[PDB]
């Protein structure tokens, strides 16, 4: 231990952490790989998602070469503040936390040739712009871009440690998605030009597909059964005016209640989602069913129904007879077009 | 030769008094500011504020930091900003601001041979924006960001937009679900307080709310129910049970729509343009039920068929007239 | 620069910030004035309000006398931590923030005679105990009390820089209130006696008056029209038993819907507000209207109404005839007593 | 003469060991504690905690801090506490606490000539209170504040209330929107663990919830709906549409009251007295509609008016009996 | 001698390298861990985590800290921990953790003559628990707490439970209104990553949710509304207004129960066991309204009473069969 104490003192004697390795001489190459311990929840309202990762960065620093009884030094994470580290930030990150309980969740390893492995445990809330025109039958590609905040590509460049596909690893049981499926990720690198220079950007896109099972039971089925229910009124006789008026009015109230609560799970987007079109058409059918009854009621010649014995009785409305076919068929046609368009 | 660079940087910070501005006791130091907007997050009516994420670059020249012999622009570790004088720039209307600190503090220091300093910060700030919601949701807001020096007056520091009208970039890339940016403006002025006159930089956006969401969500459900209440006029007056249930449920639905809608919309404690429309449509469905009450009240003693017939024209015509007055007054 | 460095070093040389100026010799007089940059929102549920201020304190410290080319030293705000400052705190504050972007929002100016001007920018959430018996027609005087935490009035006293009315200044464009009107403020200063001694307290009372316009449309008008709507049933004929029962029962549901939404914007206070009494009476008028029909329905001799071309027909109920006068008159008298009492 | 005081304070802290308690290795140091309650901000049933703001004073004697020659009590800048030994006092049942820091840290250090130290802190603490909500909203709660030494056992430190039952002040000035402080109590006891015996100071309050709000908001609306369902018993059984519409609407309105009731704690999943009252009222309105279903089912086969006649007595009598058992049990 | 204890501790910290683990370069240091559970504040389904407060004690031997001549266990000020090496223990699934710091940091350091270090922390941690809510509310969750070393592999450090199965106490102190502790388990294992293999300690609880609240507030209202929908079957078929009003209201009442119940319950974005029950009950009330529409549709053509008569048996029997399969599957 006393031998290792002398080695550490020699490494930091005359060491300046304000300067990158090879400053003014060569570009500093930083090899990065990410291990995703848990892909946290995705927030549609905030257009963000959470991810917990082990963020590993590797680079060569010839100032940290050492000779000793061991080839790798596994030091306390307080050693990371005594040496130069990349100023990596997440471009779309909103509020990230580097965990420090019970100690800084960081590790530092120095190999005898000067290679450094620097890992930290992070919880990152990254931005994910979402186009919700197909909600809830929508898919998203949530990016995770990182790079140097201050060092241009002429000073610091980033590479993936291994093949780009294998440089991002997701834990087998580390999934915290309740309504999304992680279909996979694509990994790429590029150059982004800003007002301060050109920077290397490392991009990881996570492809998500929302699961519609929740909204089928909660919204689509009650809306479809309510619309089918509102078309049941067409099979009641035209004489029972108070009964059918209660049927038409109460279902529009039922549709209104289901309509009101369906918007609770969406951001106040200015455009119409795929579920808003379905509810608008479902609202149109229920309202059109009461207008259909209002036309039948307008021409109703007799207020008394069929007595069951045989004095004339109202014939079954030609409007009612056709409405028993047109309304179910148009709603079936709309569903066939609607679900084929989005699924 | 990093050893030569180490000598240069160490010499610069030796004898450096961070408590003093450049040209302290002399002419004011001019600070140029450019902003690269990264995103606008949540323009909230409840809190009367909006969240802004930006790259805040400040440009000023400090002769004490001029160096020679290095044909390079020295980008240093962000912790060097704690050993250098920086302007005491603050945002007057901001409510809660933080500099991002993962993986390290999102801060940039770039030195130049002539002594020019580039100081960049990635800042997320919630800035107050007192909105006039009288025409909501058909309103147009003007949210600003006020940039000012706290302790140093105009005799000590000057603020200007570096690049003129191109000092702020990224506005065209901003996507807001509820708002669309119509125009942004840059203003340079002075603000006088009791302690002196201070430089002020103002960045302001004019936001026009999109009506497409509210047509399908609030206006149309109220219009359809109001048209639904007109169906009573086409029912014969002998059906008391049918016309009262139709009128009552529409009235109850309107209360349901209003009470439940207000639990979605922000808790704006004053009357909005939409509150006039919803309350106006409640009156129409209230007059429709009251219309039958008059017909039911006189068909016994006695005209009655005339009142029902005229209501089929007056109510659609008055509601159209109400909409014409409402929409021309607000749009 | 070197000369000015020696001046700053000389001021802090031998300075003991643990001792107040004139300790053991005289009372330290602190002159305070407040510039309210924005009077923030008031929260009824938390019984608190937010205010953003420039908090200025001024006192004399003979240890900071200097002679130099300038008479006033406008220094970096980090100089404040190295000198003595008053330990002012807000007595009714709940959670305050000293803004730190992009630098500590503080200023410190030292005049040549030792006078110190010390200003900071603060967001203060202060307690405002509210009596909500007259809600939503209530007025409140939200206070802001500040003083020394550890120094008694024999050690530190506080005064306003100018006349008390002119020592608290509100910006013209600094009204962030939505449901309140700032009528003005009263400024006072007294002595608070505690278990640790007697302390000088500076008091500012902000007089707020709630705006009733929102609640007239949202709650009062629907409640009045719902009560009036329930009294429309009195004008329906006594033969419309299903129709009048639907009118009676549905309006009691409408009142329940209106009543429920009225506690969305109130704290869970154990006492009854002025709006609770209005809804309770509105419930009584609505409830008594259906009970009136039950009495009318109890004596109804015939199930058929007037045929229109005339057998006996039910007469207009004397209960119904008087209800058309008693119910509106009593509700009008209740409104006159209610609104005159609170307005 | 502040120069002499500066010498005195520096002499006290010269060689002062902050890790050792007063009279280390000797008799335990007695710490006296008195609390001035500034306010009780919130009491939460959902989180089973309450928020308390108080002035927390600790009194103990340290002969190392005794001074002579100055006829004064030395009130020092609060940063001296970082250079003094203070008890490691913590609140055993707190969930999250902080010391206020505007404009500076809300901390008081006052020395006395005999060596007595007064240490005051202004603390807002969210303390755990395991509330029994079985009698809600007619319940009584006992929320405590446990004060204990973390590391030091009774062999090293001792706690007591300075002034006896007068050690806690400001309780009678507290106003809570939903509660009233019936009584407060002070307890001093020694608690034995496996690692030793530790001093304990306990401050407890008894809170009695005010029933007045819930009579107007929950109980009376539920009673009136229950009475409304009895109107069906007074309607002719031939009016099938009228009596079913009255019965169905009231049953739904009972669900609307039950679902929408903010004050009935629809958030935490616990059993309360109001839950049993609302469920009991729902049974009554459900039996009234079911009562008609028996009358409507047999008035054609054939005593039919008997069921209606008895329901006019049994339902009001049973609901009165239900209220008698309920109100005697919970009051 | 208080000076002798001070001199002994100062000698230990003059030549102590915190950057190196005990026995660096040699055999791994064994760290024993015992947990004293103080409370479990909240178990959140919405956030998929739980809040745990505990006394976290670590137990390892450092030969560099061995001292002689003092027959005592040194209880030092918590600030001495910053100068000593401590294991880099972290909680893998923790989302937000802090050490309580009122009135001081809730931290304990105790030294022993042979160099053994007892290190205790009072920690409130929000740890992630991916709950499977398919059987909600009749579900049984398993929430763990993963304890691991971040930087040191199994060749450097070893974890073990101090006391075996007795290492975790205070489980009987856990008082959750919504959950009851059925079993707790201690696991010691090794976890392999790309950077090496690390020691892992796991503390898991099996939480069983209490069904009583949901029977009273959700299941019972749903059953009675479904039973309420059967009242139509006992009404004569000529009462079209009465039977449609009963059928339509119950259908609307069932929706109002669902749309408002979901706004209270934890809004997970998938289907729960109760979502299958509520959707099953909606079908029954929907079939009952469809049942009358069939009767009303065919009594005109001419066994009409047979459809009503069989509905009085099939619907109660099928709903009983639905409940029999549902409750045997989830219990
Ligand atoms: C994990 O990371 C957090 C930061 O995200 C750390 O908190 C900070 O730790 C620093 C190192 O110990 C502290 O310097 C810093 O400041 C502390 O603040 C505590 C109160 O918190 C309030 O005030 C701060 C400062 O204004 C404010 O930032 C915060 O939002 C709150 O309003 C103090 O109690 C604490 O005092 C401690 O140290 C002083 C040293 O003189 C002692 O005198 C005290 O007795 C006490 O021991 C200190 O001043 C912390 N807070 C920040 C930055 O907000 C955690 O410590 C990290 N954990 C670990 C395990 O590393
Ligand atoms: C949101 O709302 C804010 C107000 O709250 C608007 O901000 C105003 O913007 C206008 C420009 O559109 C500003 O007007 C301009 O101010 C400039 C600066 O004035 C300062 O400096 C001069 C000396 O240089 C002083 O005399 C003066 O008192 C100020 O201290 C002027 O230089 C401009 O003058 C030019 O235009 C005028 C005519 O308008 C000509 O007469 C001049 O010759 C010259 O060409 C001009 O007056 C105004 O000051 C801003 N107000 C505030 C409070 O900042 C935002 O524009 C608005 N947002 C949007 C999107 O519209
Ligand atoms: C909220 O709920 C808590 C319990 O969870 C209540 O706290 C209890 O309060 C009672 C008083 O109402 C306490 O009883 C008192 O305990 C004192 C300490 O006893 C300990 O120490 C003695 C030795 O000194 C031991 O013998 C004993 O076993 C304990 O270890 C006693 O000194 C008190 O004595 C008083 O009563 C006796 C008669 O009973 C007299 O002879 C005495 O002269 C004296 O008057 C007393 O017994 C009890 O200890 C508290 N328990 C806890 C756990 O704190 C709160 O009161 C309650 N809040 C409210 C508002 O009611
Ligand atoms: C919540 O869910 C978690 C999983 O997500 C459960 O955790 C598992 O708990 C079981 C016990 O119920 C664990 O199984 C046991 O693991 C022990 C440790 O295994 C490690 O160490 C051994 C060497 O000692 C290695 O060989 C092995 O690869 C591991 O590295 C074993 O020692 C146990 O074996 C014992 O029983 C078997 C027979 O069953 C005998 O043959 C053995 O000789 C020995 O006596 C056993 O296998 C399992 O490891 C845990 N998994 C994880 C990931 O922690 C929680 O239990 C659950 N919560 C509740 C309350 O149930
Ligand atoms: C949105 C709905 C719009 C509806 C618009 C409706 C526009 C419109 O005016 O319709 C009236 C007409 C007939 O309506 P309906 O059959 O209800 O009315 C009958 C009609 O009036 C006969 O003339 C009467 O016999 P008679 O001659 O007096 O002896 C008969 O009396 P009775 O024998 O019963 O006693 C009435 O019942 O309907 C269509 O042609 C359906 C078109 C396709 C409608 C397709 C709808 C999807
Ligand atoms: C909530 C209030 C409850 C009040 C309950 C009050 C209950 C109460 O006392 O009722 C008695 C009576 C009912 O009068 P109402 O007009 O309702 O009933 C008439 C009454 O029964 C006559 O006796 C009948 O004539 P007849 O001789 O049999 O041929 C008449 O038959 P028809 O001619 O129609 O065929 C019935 O209609 O009302 C009053 O005296 C005025 C009370 C004013 C009360 C005003 C209260 C504001
Ligand atoms: C210091 O701590 C050690 C370890 O806990 C104490 O040793 C224990 O002393 C108790 C005394 O009753 C014995 O029952 C245990 O068997 C001992 N355990 C071990 C491992 O030695 C020791 O007594 C403590 N010393 C002081 C002065 O408190």
XYZ file of C-alpha atoms in Angstrom, chain B:
331
model
C 4.129 21.077 -25.351
C 1.654 20.896 -22.475
C 4.331 21.972 -19.984
C 4.599 25.343 -21.736
C 0.792 25.585 -21.733
C 0.756 24.785 -18.010
C 3.195 27.634 -17.348
C 1.045 30.056 -19.363
C -2.222 29.168 -17.617
C -0.611 29.188 -14.161
C 0.900 32.623 -14.832
C -2.510 33.993 -15.866
C -4.194 32.983 -12.602
C -1.306 34.168 -10.402
C -2.315 37.540 -9.000
C -5.784 37.359 -10.567
C -8.407 39.199 -8.488
C -11.803 37.698 -9.318
C -13.504 40.409 -7.227
C -12.701 43.061 -9.869
C -14.147 43.516 -13.346
C -11.829 44.119 -16.314
C -10.953 47.812 -16.624
C -12.130 48.244 -13.037
C -12.233 51.943 -12.220
C -12.085 52.829 -15.913
C -14.397 52.576 -18.911
C -17.180 49.982 -18.694
C -16.540 46.483 -20.006
C -18.754 45.599 -22.969
C -20.312 42.127 -22.789
C -21.772 40.557 -25.926
C -24.416 37.869 -25.550
C -25.690 35.265 -27.998
C -28.234 32.555 -27.196
C -28.699 29.194 -28.912
C -32.135 27.992 -27.830
C -32.237 24.229 -27.331
C -35.934 23.846 -26.454
C -38.932 25.500 -24.823
C -40.378 22.901 -22.488
C -43.677 23.782 -20.780
C -45.489 27.106 -21.267
C -47.752 26.858 -18.206
C -50.834 29.020 -17.637
C -51.281 27.801 -14.041
C -47.878 29.137 -12.981
C -47.848 31.946 -15.594
C -44.347 30.930 -16.663
C -42.448 28.965 -19.289
C -39.375 26.739 -19.232
C -36.432 27.521 -21.507
C -33.317 25.456 -22.193
C -30.564 27.354 -23.962
C -26.851 27.702 -24.605
C -26.001 31.033 -22.964
C -22.765 32.412 -24.414
C -21.307 35.644 -23.037
C -18.493 37.405 -24.892
C -16.239 39.934 -23.193
C -12.577 40.908 -23.335
C -10.289 40.779 -20.288
C -6.794 42.115 -20.955
C -5.526 40.254 -17.877
C -6.163 36.958 -19.713
C -4.314 37.863 -22.918
C -1.577 35.373 -23.786
C 1.075 35.148 -26.492
C 3.162 32.407 -28.058
C 0.286 29.926 -28.429
C -1.442 29.875 -31.866
C -4.455 28.135 -30.316
C -7.732 28.985 -28.618
C -7.432 27.477 -25.134
C -10.520 25.464 -24.212
C -10.007 24.697 -20.519
C -11.726 22.498 -17.961
C -15.008 24.066 -16.873
C -13.794 24.358 -13.265
C -11.504 27.210 -14.359
C -14.548 29.511 -14.449
C -14.500 29.532 -10.635
C -11.033 31.133 -10.749
C -11.993 33.860 -13.250
C -14.143 36.963 -13.117
C -17.459 36.488 -14.910
C -20.310 39.003 -15.312
C -22.954 38.850 -12.606
C -25.654 38.269 -15.206
C -29.060 37.260 -13.858
C -32.546 36.819 -15.283
C -34.978 39.214 -13.628
C -38.198 37.354 -14.449
C -36.807 33.843 -13.910
C -38.277 31.763 -11.089
C -36.024 28.684 -10.886
C -32.813 28.196 -12.873
C -30.062 25.589 -12.787
C -26.945 24.782 -14.790
C -26.892 21.158 -15.929
C -24.242 19.116 -14.159
C -24.121 15.681 -15.811
C -21.677 14.314 -16.471
C -19.890 17.468 -15.333
C -21.168 21.033 -15.061
C -22.417 22.106 -18.499
C -20.076 25.089 -18.576
C -17.570 26.251 -21.191
C -14.496 28.476 -20.983
C -12.614 29.310 -24.184
C -9.701 31.748 -24.191
C -8.300 33.635 -27.161
C -4.841 35.144 -27.760
C -6.136 38.733 -27.841
C -7.768 38.261 -24.429
C -11.325 37.560 -25.587
C -13.291 35.179 -23.367
C -16.078 32.869 -24.517
C -18.203 31.738 -21.573
C -20.974 29.240 -22.283
C -23.596 27.781 -19.970
C -26.338 25.262 -20.703
C -29.188 26.593 -18.579
C -32.743 25.444 -17.984
C -34.766 28.323 -16.570
C -38.401 28.845 -15.641
C -39.182 32.487 -16.396
C -42.320 34.325 -15.347
C -44.660 35.390 -18.163
C -47.757 37.272 -16.994
C -50.286 36.203 -19.622
C -53.515 38.029 -20.436
C -55.951 35.116 -20.746
C -59.059 37.219 -21.450
C -59.185 35.880 -25.023
C -58.041 32.362 -24.111
C -57.958 30.018 -25.964
C -57.945 32.507 -28.874
C -55.217 34.597 -27.233
C -51.740 35.689 -28.290
C -49.044 35.960 -25.638
C -45.763 37.873 -25.439
C -43.260 36.099 -23.181
C -39.901 37.730 -22.526
C -36.547 36.902 -20.977
C -34.962 39.804 -19.104
C -31.160 39.772 -18.949
C -29.574 42.246 -16.556
C -26.506 42.876 -14.424
C -27.263 42.807 -10.709
C -24.495 44.748 -8.985
C -22.745 46.602 -11.804
C -24.431 49.676 -13.275
C -24.114 51.128 -16.775
C -20.945 52.933 -15.656
C -19.351 49.512 -15.040
C -20.733 47.125 -17.687
C -22.451 47.242 -21.080
C -24.647 44.583 -22.687
C -25.130 44.084 -26.421
C -26.439 41.337 -28.701
C -23.398 39.885 -30.465
C -24.319 39.625 -34.130
C -27.169 42.132 -34.152
C -30.459 40.443 -34.992
C -28.697 37.091 -35.506
C -27.586 36.873 -31.864
C -30.376 34.376 -31.075
C -30.597 31.156 -33.083
C -32.755 28.056 -32.928
C -36.092 29.872 -32.661
C -37.286 28.458 -35.990
C -36.520 24.924 -34.756
C -38.698 25.279 -31.643
C -41.794 23.064 -31.629
C -44.476 23.790 -29.045
C -47.543 21.524 -28.883
C -49.898 24.345 -27.877
C -48.172 27.449 -29.304
C -46.540 28.609 -32.523
C -43.829 31.277 -32.436
C -44.805 34.166 -34.709
C -41.868 36.519 -34.117
C -38.903 37.068 -31.822
C -37.276 40.401 -31.038
C -34.064 41.679 -29.472
C -34.062 44.855 -27.376
C -31.153 46.661 -25.712
C -32.084 49.292 -23.141
C -31.424 50.629 -19.646
C -33.552 50.103 -16.532
C -33.366 52.582 -13.646
C -33.752 51.397 -10.050
C -33.103 53.082 -6.711
C -29.489 51.855 -6.733
C -28.687 53.037 -10.262
C -29.214 52.434 -13.963
C -28.491 48.917 -15.195
C -28.074 47.475 -18.704
C -30.947 45.348 -19.962
C -31.136 42.807 -22.775
C -34.628 41.587 -23.644
C -35.528 38.529 -25.707
C -39.257 38.263 -26.377
C -41.404 35.755 -28.236
C -44.912 36.321 -29.561
C -46.885 33.087 -29.245
C -50.136 32.467 -31.122
C -52.220 29.660 -29.673
C -53.472 26.984 -32.055
C -57.270 26.664 -32.117
C -57.390 23.205 -33.715
C -57.265 21.360 -30.394
C -60.033 23.441 -28.805
C -62.415 23.151 -31.769
C -62.533 19.363 -31.389
C -62.437 19.369 -27.571
C -64.550 22.202 -26.138
C -66.327 24.293 -28.775
C -67.800 21.472 -30.878
C -69.181 19.377 -27.963
C -70.927 22.510 -26.689
C -72.325 23.379 -30.128
C -73.639 19.851 -30.723
C -75.383 19.773 -27.340
C -76.906 23.185 -28.066
C -78.148 21.865 -31.410
C -79.336 18.789 -29.501
C -81.473 21.040 -27.290
C -83.175 22.373 -30.433
C -84.624 18.897 -31.059
C -87.200 19.619 -28.352
C -88.718 22.260 -30.645
C -89.569 19.498 -33.153
C -91.316 17.312 -30.546
C -95.044 17.739 -29.970
C -96.004 19.440 -26.718
C -98.175 16.527 -25.559
C -94.955 14.595 -24.813
C -94.016 16.264 -21.542
C -91.779 13.386 -20.433
C -89.817 13.385 -23.694
C -89.175 17.121 -23.959
C -88.288 17.688 -20.298
C -85.874 14.731 -20.265
C -84.275 15.987 -23.474
C -83.962 19.501 -22.078
C -82.884 18.467 -18.589
C -80.184 16.033 -19.774
C -78.747 18.600 -22.197
C -78.643 21.124 -19.359
C -77.076 18.534 -17.063
C -74.668 17.535 -19.834
C -73.674 21.187 -20.244
C -72.942 21.386 -16.526
C -71.075 18.092 -16.818
C -69.098 19.392 -19.796
C -68.375 22.687 -18.032
C -67.468 21.244 -14.628
C -65.326 18.466 -16.116
C -63.741 20.743 -18.727
C -62.628 23.190 -16.056
C -60.841 20.301 -14.327
C -58.724 19.886 -17.493
C -58.054 23.520 -18.348
C -55.620 25.471 -16.163
C -57.055 26.962 -12.969
C -57.295 30.505 -14.351
C -59.335 32.317 -11.616
C -60.940 34.965 -13.869
C -63.258 34.879 -16.858
C -61.731 33.682 -20.149
C -63.143 34.012 -23.650
C -64.143 30.329 -23.499
C -65.932 30.896 -20.185
C -68.145 33.406 -21.994
C -68.898 30.856 -24.722
C -69.663 27.940 -22.397
C -71.841 30.129 -20.180
C -73.485 31.545 -23.297
C -74.302 28.060 -24.562
C -75.678 27.122 -21.137
C -78.180 29.983 -21.484
C -79.331 28.681 -24.877
C -79.978 25.196 -23.499
C -81.586 26.825 -20.450
C -83.861 28.911 -22.675
C -84.759 25.794 -24.681
C -86.075 24.092 -21.546
C -87.689 27.368 -20.462
C -89.235 27.575 -23.946
C -91.182 24.357 -23.353
C -92.234 25.538 -19.889
C -94.050 28.431 -21.553
C -95.678 26.120 -24.102
C -96.700 23.694 -21.346
C -98.020 26.656 -19.327
C -100.506 27.940 -21.918
C -101.712 24.998 -23.981
C -104.264 24.303 -21.238
C -105.836 27.751 -20.970
C -105.788 28.578 -24.679
C -100.455 30.695 -30.097
C -98.981 27.589 -28.471
C -98.182 26.004 -31.831
C -96.867 29.395 -32.981
C -94.357 29.645 -30.124
C -92.994 26.183 -30.921
C -92.828 27.022 -34.636
C -91.037 30.337 -34.100
C -88.527 28.754 -31.718
C -87.327 26.540 -34.583
C -86.104 29.705 -36.343
C -85.248 32.183 -33.577
C -82.985 29.853 -31.591
C -80.840 28.760 -34.590
C -80.738 32.378 -35.785
C -79.872 33.856 -32.386
C -77.181 31.256 -31.702
C -75.667 32.019 -35.107
C -75.877 35.727 -34.265
C -74.253 35.055 -30.889
C -71.438 33.165 -32.615
C -70.986 35.971 -35.150
C -70.657 38.557 -32.375
C -68.435 36.261 -30.300
C -66.077 35.220 -33.091
C -65.730 38.682 -34.640
C -65.008 40.182 -31.211
C -62.290 37.629 -30.413
C -60.894 36.638 -33.823
